[PDB]
Amino acid sequence: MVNSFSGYLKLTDNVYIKNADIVEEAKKVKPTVVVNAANVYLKHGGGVAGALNKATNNAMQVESDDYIATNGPLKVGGSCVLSGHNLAKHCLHVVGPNVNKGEDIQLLKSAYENFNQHEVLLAPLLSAGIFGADPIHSLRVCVDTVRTNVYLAVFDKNLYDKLVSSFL
Ligand SMILES: Nc1ncnc2c1ncn2[C@@H]1O[C@H](COP(=O)(O)OP(=O)(O)OC[C@H]2O[C@H](O)[C@H](O)[C@@H]2O)[C@@H](O)[C@H]1O
Protein backbone atom coordinates (compact mmCIF):
# COMPACT_ATOMS: atom_id res chain seq x y z
CA MET A 1 0.00 0.00 0.00
CA VAL A 2 1.05 3.63 -0.66
CA ASN A 3 -0.16 6.08 1.98
CA SER A 4 0.09 9.86 2.09
CA PHE A 5 2.43 9.99 5.15
CA SER A 6 4.59 13.03 4.61
CA GLY A 7 7.27 14.90 6.48
CA TYR A 8 8.63 11.92 8.43
CA LEU A 9 12.27 11.58 9.45
CA LYS A 10 13.72 8.14 8.76
CA LEU A 11 15.13 6.31 11.78
CA THR A 12 15.76 2.85 10.32
CA ASP A 13 14.73 0.74 7.34
CA ASN A 14 11.21 0.41 8.79
CA VAL A 15 10.76 3.12 11.46
CA TYR A 16 9.87 6.75 10.73
CA ILE A 17 9.10 9.62 13.12
CA LYS A 18 7.40 13.02 13.01
CA ASN A 19 6.54 15.79 15.49
CA ALA A 20 2.77 15.63 15.02
CA ASP A 21 -0.50 14.94 16.77
CA ILE A 22 -1.50 11.35 16.00
CA VAL A 23 -5.13 12.49 15.67
CA GLU A 24 -4.23 14.99 12.94
CA GLU A 25 -2.03 12.45 11.16
CA ALA A 26 -4.81 9.89 11.25
CA LYS A 27 -7.40 12.38 9.99
CA LYS A 28 -5.16 13.37 7.07
CA VAL A 29 -3.76 9.95 6.07
CA LYS A 30 -6.66 7.65 7.04
CA PRO A 31 -4.20 4.76 7.53
CA THR A 32 -5.20 1.11 7.63
CA VAL A 33 -4.08 0.94 11.28
CA VAL A 34 -3.74 3.58 13.96
CA VAL A 35 -2.32 2.36 17.28
CA ASN A 36 -3.78 3.42 20.60
CA ALA A 37 -1.68 3.38 23.80
CA ALA A 38 -4.39 1.72 25.87
CA ASN A 39 -4.99 0.45 29.37
CA VAL A 40 -6.33 -3.08 29.93
CA TYR A 41 -9.87 -1.76 30.51
CA LEU A 42 -9.95 0.25 27.27
CA LYS A 43 -10.95 3.31 29.36
CA HIS A 44 -9.74 6.03 26.99
CA GLY A 45 -9.26 8.91 29.39
CA GLY A 46 -6.25 10.97 28.35
CA GLY A 47 -3.16 11.15 26.16
CA VAL A 48 -3.41 9.34 22.85
CA ALA A 49 -6.44 7.29 23.86
CA GLY A 50 -8.49 10.21 25.10
CA ALA A 51 -7.62 12.30 22.06
CA LEU A 52 -8.39 9.52 19.56
CA ASN A 53 -11.64 8.75 21.32
CA LYS A 54 -12.76 12.40 21.39
CA ALA A 55 -12.03 12.66 17.67
CA THR A 56 -14.41 9.70 17.11
CA ASN A 57 -17.14 11.53 19.07
CA ASN A 58 -16.93 8.78 21.72
CA ALA A 59 -17.66 5.95 19.25
CA MET A 60 -14.32 4.34 20.12
CA GLN A 61 -15.30 4.23 23.81
CA VAL A 62 -18.78 2.83 23.11
CA GLU A 63 -17.25 0.08 20.94
CA SER A 64 -14.59 -0.59 23.58
CA ASP A 65 -17.23 -0.96 26.29
CA ASP A 66 -18.91 -3.71 24.24
CA TYR A 67 -15.53 -5.37 23.64
CA ILE A 68 -14.82 -5.50 27.38
CA ALA A 69 -18.33 -6.70 28.24
CA THR A 70 -17.84 -9.64 25.84
CA ASN A 71 -14.15 -10.45 26.33
CA GLY A 72 -12.91 -8.93 29.57
CA PRO A 73 -9.74 -6.86 30.00
CA LEU A 74 -6.71 -7.10 27.77
CA LYS A 75 -3.40 -8.40 29.08
CA VAL A 76 -0.57 -6.00 29.86
CA GLY A 77 1.52 -6.30 26.69
CA GLY A 78 -1.58 -7.42 24.78
CA SER A 79 -3.80 -5.90 22.15
CA CYS A 80 -7.04 -6.07 20.23
CA VAL A 81 -8.12 -4.86 16.79
CA LEU A 82 -11.22 -2.65 16.74
CA SER A 83 -12.61 -0.12 14.28
CA GLY A 84 -10.73 3.04 13.44
CA HIS A 85 -14.04 4.86 12.96
CA ASN A 86 -13.54 8.18 11.13
CA LEU A 87 -9.75 8.11 11.67
CA ALA A 88 -8.49 4.83 10.15
CA LYS A 89 -9.75 1.45 8.98
CA HIS A 90 -8.72 -0.18 12.27
CA CYS A 91 -7.45 0.85 15.68
CA LEU A 92 -4.95 -1.55 17.23
CA HIS A 93 -5.33 -0.98 20.98
CA VAL A 94 -2.02 -1.97 22.61
CA VAL A 95 -1.32 -2.01 26.36
CA GLY A 96 2.18 -1.04 27.41
CA PRO A 97 3.23 -1.59 31.03
CA ASN A 98 2.12 0.99 33.57
CA VAL A 99 5.59 1.36 35.07
CA ASN A 100 4.34 4.00 37.50
CA LYS A 101 2.06 1.32 39.05
CA GLY A 102 4.75 -1.34 39.32
CA GLU A 103 4.24 -3.21 36.06
CA ASP A 104 7.36 -4.72 34.47
CA ILE A 105 9.02 -2.54 31.83
CA GLN A 106 10.04 -5.75 30.03
CA LEU A 107 6.40 -6.09 28.90
CA LEU A 108 6.94 -3.09 26.62
CA LYS A 109 8.69 -5.45 24.18
CA SER A 110 5.67 -7.79 24.22
CA ALA A 111 3.46 -4.76 23.57
CA TYR A 112 5.43 -3.69 20.50
CA GLU A 113 5.45 -7.26 19.13
CA ASN A 114 1.75 -6.78 18.36
CA PHE A 115 2.76 -4.28 15.67
CA ASN A 116 4.39 -7.10 13.67
CA GLN A 117 0.91 -8.46 12.84
CA HIS A 118 0.27 -5.38 10.64
CA GLU A 119 2.22 -4.32 7.55
CA VAL A 120 1.88 -0.54 8.14
CA LEU A 121 0.95 1.37 11.30
CA LEU A 122 0.61 4.94 12.52
CA ALA A 123 1.57 4.75 16.20
CA PRO A 124 2.59 6.56 19.38
CA LEU A 125 5.41 5.77 21.81
CA LEU A 126 3.83 3.21 24.11
CA SER A 127 4.18 3.70 27.89
CA ALA A 128 6.11 6.97 27.41
CA GLY A 129 3.39 9.27 28.76
CA ILE A 130 1.28 8.74 31.85
CA PHE A 131 2.53 5.15 32.19
CA GLY A 132 6.00 6.49 33.06
CA ALA A 133 8.48 4.59 30.88
CA ASP A 134 11.51 6.56 29.74
CA PRO A 135 10.57 7.84 26.24
CA ILE A 136 13.94 7.08 24.65
CA HIS A 137 13.67 3.53 26.01
CA SER A 138 10.24 3.14 24.41
CA LEU A 139 11.66 4.36 21.08
CA ARG A 140 14.62 1.96 21.31
CA VAL A 141 12.34 -0.99 22.13
CA CYS A 142 10.14 -0.04 19.16
CA VAL A 143 13.14 0.07 16.80
CA ASP A 144 14.52 -3.23 18.16
CA THR A 145 11.17 -5.07 18.12
CA VAL A 146 8.98 -3.85 15.26
CA ARG A 147 9.88 -5.18 11.80
CA THR A 148 6.85 -3.89 9.89
CA ASN A 149 6.55 -0.27 8.74
CA VAL A 150 5.78 2.07 11.61
CA TYR A 151 5.18 5.83 11.42
CA LEU A 152 5.59 7.32 14.90
CA ALA A 153 3.74 10.53 15.76
CA VAL A 154 5.36 12.37 18.69
CA PHE A 155 3.08 15.18 19.93
CA ASP A 156 5.61 16.94 22.15
CA LYS A 157 8.13 19.13 20.29
CA ASN A 158 10.74 19.16 23.05
CA LEU A 159 10.56 15.38 23.31
CA TYR A 160 10.80 14.91 19.54
CA ASP A 161 13.87 17.13 19.31
CA LYS A 162 15.58 15.09 22.03
CA LEU A 163 14.60 11.69 20.58
CA VAL A 164 15.86 12.40 17.06
CA SER A 165 19.32 13.35 18.34
CA SER A 166 19.68 10.29 20.56
CA PHE A 167 21.36 7.02 19.58
CA LEU A 168 19.05 4.06 19.02
N1 LIG B 1 -2.33 13.32 20.54
C1 LIG B 1 -1.08 12.75 20.65
N2 LIG B 1 -0.39 12.48 19.54
C2 LIG B 1 0.81 11.88 19.64
N3 LIG B 1 1.46 11.56 20.75
C3 LIG B 1 0.76 11.86 21.85
C4 LIG B 1 -0.50 12.44 21.89
N4 LIG B 1 -0.91 12.57 23.20
C5 LIG B 1 0.08 12.08 23.92
N5 LIG B 1 1.12 11.66 23.14
C6 LIG B 1 2.38 11.04 23.54
O1 LIG B 1 2.21 9.59 23.42
C7 LIG B 1 3.06 8.96 24.33
C8 LIG B 1 2.24 7.98 25.16
O2 LIG B 1 1.52 8.71 26.15
P1 LIG B 1 0.09 8.21 26.70
O3 LIG B 1 -0.98 8.46 25.70
O4 LIG B 1 -0.04 8.84 28.05
O5 LIG B 1 0.27 6.61 26.77
P2 LIG B 1 0.93 5.61 27.85
O6 LIG B 1 1.12 4.32 27.12
O7 LIG B 1 2.09 6.25 28.54
O8 LIG B 1 -0.22 5.47 28.94
C9 LIG B 1 -1.43 4.77 28.62
C10 LIG B 1 -2.57 5.53 29.23
O9 LIG B 1 -2.70 6.72 28.52
C11 LIG B 1 -4.11 7.03 28.38
O10 LIG B 1 -4.58 7.70 29.45
C12 LIG B 1 -4.68 5.60 28.25
O11 LIG B 1 -6.13 5.58 28.39
C13 LIG B 1 -3.95 4.79 29.12
O12 LIG B 1 -4.55 4.61 30.43
C14 LIG B 1 3.77 10.06 25.16
O13 LIG B 1 5.08 10.24 24.66
C15 LIG B 1 2.87 11.28 24.88
O14 LIG B 1 3.55 12.54 24.89
Side-chain angles (χ1 to χ4, degrees):
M1 174 153 216
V2 177
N3 287 111
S4 62
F5 294 110
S6 68
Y8 286 74
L9 178 70
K10 192 168 177 61
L11 297 184
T12 67
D13 174 55
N14 66 298
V15 180
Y16 299 87
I17 194 163
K18 186 180 181 181
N19 182 195
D21 181 346
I22 199 172
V23 172
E24 293 307 315
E25 289 292 302
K27 285 183 176 164
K28 178 265 149 164
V29 175
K30 203 178 286 302
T32 305
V33 179
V34 64
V35 175
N36 183 29
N39 59 65
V40 296
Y41 305 110
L42 303 179
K43 287 174 183 170
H44 305 306
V48 169
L52 289 171
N53 177 57
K54 182 172 184 199
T56 76
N57 200 18
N58 209 48
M60 175 178 287
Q61 188 65 67
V62 172
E63 178 193 29
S64 292
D65 289 349
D66 171 78
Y67 174 92
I68 295 289
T70 297
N71 299 293
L74 299 180
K75 299 172 173 171
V76 180
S79 68
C80 66
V81 179
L82 291 173
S83 178
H85 302 276
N86 54 317
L87 302 177
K89 185 178 186 320
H90 306 290
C91 178
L92 179 69
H93 296 271
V94 181
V95 181
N98 186 350
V99 174
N100 284 331
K101 294 284 178 69
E103 298 180 350
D104 180 5
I105 186 59
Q106 290 174 123
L107 293 167
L108 187 56
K109 187 170 184 74
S110 306
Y112 278 114
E113 286 170 342
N114 296 297
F115 289 27
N116 290 321
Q117 300 297 317
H118 303 279
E119 287 189 355
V120 179
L121 313 90
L122 170 62
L125 291 173
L126 300 174
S127 296
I130 201 168
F131 276 3
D134 192 14
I136 187 57
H137 180 61
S138 183
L139 177 59
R140 289 175 179 150
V141 176
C142 181
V143 161
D144 291 341
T145 305
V146 182
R147 297 177 301 282
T148 55
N149 293 321
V150 59
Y151 290 82
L152 293 168
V154 174
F155 185 90
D156 188 288
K157 175 176 184 298
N158 288 331
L159 177 57
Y160 175 89
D161 291 344
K162 179 166 173 204
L163 291 174
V164 302
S165 289
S166 298
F167 71 83
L168 296 169

PDB file of all heavy atoms in Angstrom, residues 89-113:
ATOM      1  N   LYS A  89      -8.930   2.663   9.133  1.00  0.00           N
ATOM      2  CA  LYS A  89      -9.748   1.453   8.982  1.00  0.00           C
ATOM      3  C   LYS A  89      -9.901   0.736  10.325  1.00  0.00           C
ATOM      4  O   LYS A  89     -11.017   0.375  10.747  1.00  0.00           O
ATOM      5  CB  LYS A  89      -9.168   0.521   7.915  1.00  0.00           C
ATOM      6  CG  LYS A  89     -10.028  -0.711   7.613  1.00  0.00           C
ATOM      7  CD  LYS A  89      -9.364  -1.514   6.493  1.00  0.00           C
ATOM      8  CE  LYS A  89     -10.186  -2.692   5.983  1.00  0.00           C
ATOM      9  NZ  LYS A  89     -10.899  -3.442   7.038  1.00  0.00           N
ATOM     10  N   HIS A  90      -8.778   0.535  11.009  1.00  0.00           N
ATOM     11  CA  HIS A  90      -8.717  -0.176  12.271  1.00  0.00           C
ATOM     12  C   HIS A  90      -7.939   0.641  13.290  1.00  0.00           C
ATOM     13  O   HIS A  90      -7.022   1.398  12.940  1.00  0.00           O
ATOM     14  CB  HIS A  90      -7.994  -1.514  12.160  1.00  0.00           C
ATOM     15  CG  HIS A  90      -8.530  -2.414  11.116  1.00  0.00           C
ATOM     16  ND1 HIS A  90      -9.760  -3.024  11.214  1.00  0.00           N
ATOM     17  CD2 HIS A  90      -7.985  -2.820   9.950  1.00  0.00           C
ATOM     18  CE1 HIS A  90      -9.940  -3.793  10.151  1.00  0.00           C
ATOM     19  NE2 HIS A  90      -8.882  -3.675   9.366  1.00  0.00           N
ATOM     20  N   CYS A  91      -8.281   0.428  14.558  1.00  0.00           N
ATOM     21  CA  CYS A  91      -7.452   0.847  15.676  1.00  0.00           C
ATOM     22  C   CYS A  91      -6.936  -0.397  16.382  1.00  0.00           C
ATOM     23  O   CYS A  91      -7.721  -1.243  16.826  1.00  0.00           O
ATOM     24  CB  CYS A  91      -8.225   1.744  16.633  1.00  0.00           C
ATOM     25  SG  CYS A  91      -7.200   2.236  18.066  1.00  0.00           S
ATOM     26  N   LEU A  92      -5.605  -0.509  16.446  1.00  0.00           N
ATOM     27  CA  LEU A  92      -4.951  -1.546  17.228  1.00  0.00           C
ATOM     28  C   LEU A  92      -4.703  -0.969  18.622  1.00  0.00           C
ATOM     29  O   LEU A  92      -3.840  -0.098  18.794  1.00  0.00           O
ATOM     30  CB  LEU A  92      -3.638  -1.969  16.570  1.00  0.00           C
ATOM     31  CG  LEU A  92      -2.857  -3.037  17.330  1.00  0.00           C
ATOM     32  CD1 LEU A  92      -3.570  -4.393  17.291  1.00  0.00           C
ATOM     33  CD2 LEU A  92      -1.438  -3.156  16.776  1.00  0.00           C
ATOM     34  N   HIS A  93      -5.494  -1.413  19.596  1.00  0.00           N
ATOM     35  CA  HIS A  93      -5.330  -0.985  20.976  1.00  0.00           C
ATOM     36  C   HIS A  93      -4.253  -1.851  21.604  1.00  0.00           C
ATOM     37  O   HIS A  93      -4.416  -3.072  21.646  1.00  0.00           O
ATOM     38  CB  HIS A  93      -6.647  -1.143  21.740  1.00  0.00           C
ATOM     39  CG  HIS A  93      -7.742  -0.280  21.222  1.00  0.00           C
ATOM     40  ND1 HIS A  93      -7.942   1.008  21.678  1.00  0.00           N
ATOM     41  CD2 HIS A  93      -8.654  -0.525  20.243  1.00  0.00           C
ATOM     42  CE1 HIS A  93      -8.961   1.496  20.991  1.00  0.00           C
ATOM     43  NE2 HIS A  93      -9.409   0.601  20.118  1.00  0.00           N
ATOM     44  N   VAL A  94      -3.156  -1.241  22.060  1.00  0.00           N
ATOM     45  CA  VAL A  94      -2.019  -1.972  22.606  1.00  0.00           C
ATOM     46  C   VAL A  94      -1.746  -1.465  24.013  1.00  0.00           C
ATOM     47  O   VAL A  94      -1.693  -0.252  24.233  1.00  0.00           O
ATOM     48  CB  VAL A  94      -0.758  -1.790  21.735  1.00  0.00           C
ATOM     49  CG1 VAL A  94       0.400  -2.584  22.328  1.00  0.00           C
ATOM     50  CG2 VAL A  94      -1.036  -2.214  20.306  1.00  0.00           C
ATOM     51  N   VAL A  95      -1.537  -2.384  24.957  1.00  0.00           N
ATOM     52  CA  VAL A  95      -1.322  -2.014  26.355  1.00  0.00           C
ATOM     53  C   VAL A  95       0.159  -2.131  26.700  1.00  0.00           C
ATOM     54  O   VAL A  95       0.686  -3.238  26.873  1.00  0.00           O
ATOM     55  CB  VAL A  95      -2.169  -2.875  27.296  1.00  0.00           C
ATOM     56  CG1 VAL A  95      -1.933  -2.426  28.736  1.00  0.00           C
ATOM     57  CG2 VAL A  95      -3.636  -2.781  26.931  1.00  0.00           C
ATOM     58  N   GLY A  96       0.852  -1.004  26.819  1.00  0.00           N
ATOM     59  CA  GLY A  96       2.176  -1.037  27.406  1.00  0.00           C
ATOM     60  C   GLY A  96       2.094  -1.179  28.919  1.00  0.00           C
ATOM     61  O   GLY A  96       1.048  -0.963  29.528  1.00  0.00           O
ATOM     62  N   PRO A  97       3.214  -1.518  29.560  1.00  0.00           N
ATOM     63  CA  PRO A  97       3.225  -1.587  31.027  1.00  0.00           C
ATOM     64  C   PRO A  97       3.060  -0.208  31.644  1.00  0.00           C
ATOM     65  O   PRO A  97       3.645   0.787  31.187  1.00  0.00           O
ATOM     66  CB  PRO A  97       4.605  -2.174  31.347  1.00  0.00           C
ATOM     67  CG  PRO A  97       5.462  -1.773  30.162  1.00  0.00           C
ATOM     68  CD  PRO A  97       4.513  -1.877  28.980  1.00  0.00           C
ATOM     69  N   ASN A  98       2.292  -0.188  32.732  1.00  0.00           N
ATOM     70  CA  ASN A  98       2.124   0.987  33.574  1.00  0.00           C
ATOM     71  C   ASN A  98       3.229   0.921  34.630  1.00  0.00           C
ATOM     72  O   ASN A  98       3.069   0.395  35.736  1.00  0.00           O
ATOM     73  CB  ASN A  98       0.727   0.991  34.169  1.00  0.00           C
ATOM     74  CG  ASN A  98       0.420   2.233  34.922  1.00  0.00           C
ATOM     75  OD1 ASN A  98       1.305   3.049  35.185  1.00  0.00           O
ATOM     76  ND2 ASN A  98      -0.848   2.395  35.295  1.00  0.00           N
ATOM     77  N   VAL A  99       4.402   1.421  34.234  1.00  0.00           N
ATOM     78  CA  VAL A  99       5.586   1.359  35.068  1.00  0.00           C
ATOM     79  C   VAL A  99       5.366   2.127  36.353  1.00  0.00           C
ATOM     80  O   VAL A  99       5.858   1.723  37.410  1.00  0.00           O
ATOM     81  CB  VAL A  99       6.787   1.890  34.271  1.00  0.00           C
ATOM     82  CG1 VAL A  99       8.014   1.991  35.118  1.00  0.00           C
ATOM     83  CG2 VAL A  99       7.049   1.003  33.068  1.00  0.00           C
ATOM     84  N   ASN A 100       4.602   3.210  36.309  1.00  0.00           N
ATOM     85  CA  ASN A 100       4.339   3.996  37.503  1.00  0.00           C
ATOM     86  C   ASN A 100       3.534   3.233  38.550  1.00  0.00           C
ATOM     87  O   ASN A 100       3.539   3.643  39.717  1.00  0.00           O
ATOM     88  CB  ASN A 100       3.593   5.273  37.141  1.00  0.00           C
ATOM     89  CG  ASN A 100       4.471   6.326  36.511  1.00  0.00           C
ATOM     90  OD1 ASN A 100       5.667   6.396  36.771  1.00  0.00           O
ATOM     91  ND2 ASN A 100       3.869   7.184  35.702  1.00  0.00           N
ATOM     92  N   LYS A 101       2.831   2.169  38.155  1.00  0.00           N
ATOM     93  CA  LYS A 101       2.063   1.325  39.055  1.00  0.00           C
ATOM     94  C   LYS A 101       2.699  -0.049  39.237  1.00  0.00           C
ATOM     95  O   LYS A 101       2.033  -1.008  39.636  1.00  0.00           O
ATOM     96  CB  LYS A 101       0.600   1.241  38.625  1.00  0.00           C
ATOM     97  CG  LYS A 101      -0.162   2.562  38.729  1.00  0.00           C
ATOM     98  CD  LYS A 101      -0.527   2.910  40.152  1.00  0.00           C
ATOM     99  CE  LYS A 101      -1.261   4.266  40.219  1.00  0.00           C
ATOM    100  NZ  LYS A 101      -2.654   4.324  39.642  1.00  0.00           N
ATOM    101  N   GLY A 102       3.994  -0.148  38.986  1.00  0.00           N
ATOM    102  CA  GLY A 102       4.749  -1.339  39.319  1.00  0.00           C
ATOM    103  C   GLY A 102       4.818  -2.408  38.254  1.00  0.00           C
ATOM    104  O   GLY A 102       5.416  -3.464  38.500  1.00  0.00           O
ATOM    105  N   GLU A 103       4.218  -2.192  37.093  1.00  0.00           N
ATOM    106  CA  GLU A 103       4.239  -3.214  36.060  1.00  0.00           C
ATOM    107  C   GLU A 103       5.625  -3.266  35.411  1.00  0.00           C
ATOM    108  O   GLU A 103       6.339  -2.265  35.332  1.00  0.00           O
ATOM    109  CB  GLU A 103       3.129  -2.954  35.039  1.00  0.00           C
ATOM    110  CG  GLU A 103       1.742  -3.019  35.691  1.00  0.00           C
ATOM    111  CD  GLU A 103       0.586  -2.787  34.762  1.00  0.00           C
ATOM    112  OE1 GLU A 103       0.797  -2.386  33.598  1.00  0.00           O
ATOM    113  OE2 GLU A 103      -0.567  -3.028  35.223  1.00  0.00           O
ATOM    114  N   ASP A 104       6.000  -4.451  34.943  1.00  0.00           N
ATOM    115  CA  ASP A 104       7.359  -4.721  34.474  1.00  0.00           C
ATOM    116  C   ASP A 104       7.616  -4.058  33.124  1.00  0.00           C
ATOM    117  O   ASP A 104       6.950  -4.378  32.127  1.00  0.00           O
ATOM    118  CB  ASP A 104       7.508  -6.246  34.382  1.00  0.00           C
ATOM    119  CG  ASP A 104       8.877  -6.746  33.897  1.00  0.00           C
ATOM    120  OD1 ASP A 104       9.815  -5.960  33.685  1.00  0.00           O
ATOM    121  OD2 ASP A 104       8.959  -7.982  33.705  1.00  0.00           O
ATOM    122  N   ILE A 105       8.624  -3.184  33.079  1.00  0.00           N
ATOM    123  CA  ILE A 105       9.017  -2.542  31.834  1.00  0.00           C
ATOM    124  C   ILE A 105       9.334  -3.544  30.733  1.00  0.00           C
ATOM    125  O   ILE A 105       9.209  -3.216  29.556  1.00  0.00           O
ATOM    126  CB  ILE A 105      10.195  -1.573  32.107  1.00  0.00           C
ATOM    127  CG1 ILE A 105      10.558  -0.744  30.877  1.00  0.00           C
ATOM    128  CG2 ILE A 105      11.435  -2.334  32.574  1.00  0.00           C
ATOM    129  CD1 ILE A 105       9.455   0.100  30.322  1.00  0.00           C
ATOM    130  N   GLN A 106       9.752  -4.765  31.073  1.00  0.00           N
ATOM    131  CA  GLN A 106      10.043  -5.746  30.031  1.00  0.00           C
ATOM    132  C   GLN A 106       8.824  -6.053  29.157  1.00  0.00           C
ATOM    133  O   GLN A 106       8.981  -6.455  27.994  1.00  0.00           O
ATOM    134  CB  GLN A 106      10.620  -6.998  30.686  1.00  0.00           C
ATOM    135  CG  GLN A 106      12.040  -6.726  31.227  1.00  0.00           C
ATOM    136  CD  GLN A 106      12.625  -7.861  32.011  1.00  0.00           C
ATOM    137  OE1 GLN A 106      13.685  -8.356  31.675  1.00  0.00           O
ATOM    138  NE2 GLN A 106      11.942  -8.270  33.077  1.00  0.00           N
ATOM    139  N   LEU A 107       7.606  -5.855  29.676  1.00  0.00           N
ATOM    140  CA  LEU A 107       6.396  -6.090  28.898  1.00  0.00           C
ATOM    141  C   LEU A 107       6.226  -5.095  27.762  1.00  0.00           C
ATOM    142  O   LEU A 107       5.385  -5.308  26.882  1.00  0.00           O
ATOM    143  CB  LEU A 107       5.169  -6.082  29.812  1.00  0.00           C
ATOM    144  CG  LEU A 107       5.118  -7.246  30.793  1.00  0.00           C
ATOM    145  CD1 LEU A 107       4.068  -7.009  31.869  1.00  0.00           C
ATOM    146  CD2 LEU A 107       4.828  -8.533  30.047  1.00  0.00           C
ATOM    147  N   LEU A 108       7.010  -4.015  27.738  1.00  0.00           N
ATOM    148  CA  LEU A 108       6.940  -3.091  26.618  1.00  0.00           C
ATOM    149  C   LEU A 108       7.361  -3.783  25.315  1.00  0.00           C
ATOM    150  O   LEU A 108       6.821  -3.469  24.249  1.00  0.00           O
ATOM    151  CB  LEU A 108       7.795  -1.871  26.956  1.00  0.00           C
ATOM    152  CG  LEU A 108       7.723  -0.712  25.968  1.00  0.00           C
ATOM    153  CD1 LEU A 108       6.303  -0.216  25.752  1.00  0.00           C
ATOM    154  CD2 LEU A 108       8.591   0.425  26.474  1.00  0.00           C
ATOM    155  N   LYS A 109       8.320  -4.720  25.382  1.00  0.00           N
ATOM    156  CA  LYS A 109       8.693  -5.449  24.179  1.00  0.00           C
ATOM    157  C   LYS A 109       7.518  -6.296  23.676  1.00  0.00           C
ATOM    158  O   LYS A 109       7.212  -6.303  22.477  1.00  0.00           O
ATOM    159  CB  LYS A 109       9.941  -6.291  24.423  1.00  0.00           C
ATOM    160  CG  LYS A 109      10.461  -6.928  23.131  1.00  0.00           C
ATOM    161  CD  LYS A 109      11.826  -7.573  23.301  1.00  0.00           C
ATOM    162  CE  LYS A 109      12.377  -8.112  21.982  1.00  0.00           C
ATOM    163  NZ  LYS A 109      12.859  -7.042  21.065  1.00  0.00           N
ATOM    164  N   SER A 110       6.842  -7.003  24.589  1.00  0.00           N
ATOM    165  CA  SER A 110       5.671  -7.786  24.217  1.00  0.00           C
ATOM    166  C   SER A 110       4.606  -6.901  23.576  1.00  0.00           C
ATOM    167  O   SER A 110       3.962  -7.288  22.591  1.00  0.00           O
ATOM    168  CB  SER A 110       5.124  -8.487  25.457  1.00  0.00           C
ATOM    169  OG  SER A 110       6.174  -9.226  26.056  1.00  0.00           O
ATOM    170  N   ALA A 111       4.424  -5.693  24.126  1.00  0.00           N
ATOM    171  CA  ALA A 111       3.456  -4.758  23.566  1.00  0.00           C
ATOM    172  C   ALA A 111       3.796  -4.414  22.114  1.00  0.00           C
ATOM    173  O   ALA A 111       2.941  -4.491  21.221  1.00  0.00           O
ATOM    174  CB  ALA A 111       3.409  -3.495  24.425  1.00  0.00           C
ATOM    175  N   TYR A 112       5.052  -4.036  21.857  1.00  0.00           N
ATOM    176  CA  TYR A 112       5.434  -3.685  20.496  1.00  0.00           C
ATOM    177  C   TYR A 112       5.389  -4.870  19.533  1.00  0.00           C
ATOM    178  O   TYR A 112       5.197  -4.664  18.332  1.00  0.00           O
ATOM    179  CB  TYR A 112       6.826  -3.028  20.462  1.00  0.00           C
ATOM    180  CG  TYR A 112       6.818  -1.556  20.805  1.00  0.00           C
ATOM    181  CD1 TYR A 112       7.426  -1.075  21.963  1.00  0.00           C
ATOM    182  CD2 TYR A 112       6.212  -0.638  19.946  1.00  0.00           C
ATOM    183  CE1 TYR A 112       7.455   0.293  22.246  1.00  0.00           C
ATOM    184  CE2 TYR A 112       6.233   0.727  20.222  1.00  0.00           C
ATOM    185  CZ  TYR A 112       6.861   1.185  21.366  1.00  0.00           C
ATOM    186  OH  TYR A 112       6.869   2.541  21.585  1.00  0.00           O
ATOM    187  N   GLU A 113       5.540  -6.106  20.023  1.00  0.00           N
ATOM    188  CA  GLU A 113       5.446  -7.260  19.133  1.00  0.00           C
ATOM    189  C   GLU A 113       4.100  -7.313  18.421  1.00  0.00           C
ATOM    190  O   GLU A 113       4.007  -7.845  17.311  1.00  0.00           O
ATOM    191  CB  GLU A 113       5.707  -8.560  19.903  1.00  0.00           C
ATOM    192  CG  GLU A 113       7.183  -8.722  20.235  1.00  0.00           C
ATOM    193  CD  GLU A 113       7.527  -9.857  21.189  1.00  0.00           C
ATOM    194  OE1 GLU A 113       6.639 -10.376  21.903  1.00  0.00           O
ATOM    195  OE2 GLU A 113       8.733 -10.204  21.243  1.00  0.00           O
TER     196      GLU A 113
END
